[PDB]
Amino acid sequence: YTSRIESLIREAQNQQEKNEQALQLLSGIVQQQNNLLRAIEAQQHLLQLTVWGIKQLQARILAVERYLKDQQ
Amino acid sequence: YTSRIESLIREAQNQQEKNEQALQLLSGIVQQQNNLLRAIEAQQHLLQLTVWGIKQLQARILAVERYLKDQQ
Amino acid sequence: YTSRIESLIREAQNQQEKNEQALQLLSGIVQQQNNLLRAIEAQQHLLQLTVWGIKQLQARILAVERYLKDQQ
């Protein structure tokens, strides 16, 4: 879970409209590119946690699969 | 699963070449930034579903782990 | 796992500072937009693998859930 990614998505949304209405535009485009980068970084942190969480589940289910096989 | 993210990736790909060949460029750069934002939003929706799906699995495997412990 | 996404995040980080200090800027902005696109594509590949991995776990845990029900 991360609500920061949501806040970054809305922040790039506001910066996008300000660029579209202005189309100082170069500063809003550079500022917009920093917003997208922060969101990509925030997603990669959450995407990294989902990778570690999938590995944990694969180890937990394999321990159960091997347990039910050893009982026989 | 989401095939929309793929379509958005190809759409930013076409807009990238049009900007690289043009390098009206400001409009293609603003249009490109909206494409990347849509893809980031589409990935966050899929990344959100993968978070809920991992929690469900952790509850399902914990129910099985506790079941095999209660049987003893 | 993918360390390429990390390298792409740092590469967009270096390009962001070069754009912020320059604020030839148009070329750095187009070059920055290609960096973010590569990272979005690299995350979607990893996000796709996490989707296939969650489906596999759901099938493995359902096989165990059905096994413990058939034993009764």
Swiss-Prot record, chains A, B, C:
It is found in: Virion membrane; Host cell membrane; Host endosome membrane. It is a single-pass type I membrane protein. Residues 55-72 are annotated as: Immunosuppression. The mature envelope protein (Env) consists of a homotrimer of non-covalently associated gp120-gp41 heterodimers. The resulting complex protrudes from the virus surface as a spike. There seems to be as few as 10 spikes on the average virion. Acts as a class I viral fusion protein. Under the current model, the protein has at least 3 conformational states: pre-fusion native state, pre-hairpin intermediate state, and post-fusion hairpin state. During fusion of viral and target intracellular membranes, the coiled coil regions (heptad repeats) assume a trimer-of-hairpins structure, positioning the fusion peptide in close proximity to the C-terminal region of the ectodomain. The formation of this structure appears to drive apposition and subsequent fusion of viral and target cell membranes. This is Transmembrane protein gp41. It comes from Human immunodeficiency virus type 1 group M subtype B (isolate HXB2) (HIV-1). The lineage of its organism: Viruses, Riboviria, Pararnavirae, Artverviricota, Revtraviricetes. The chain holds residues 543 to 591 of 856 of the full protein.
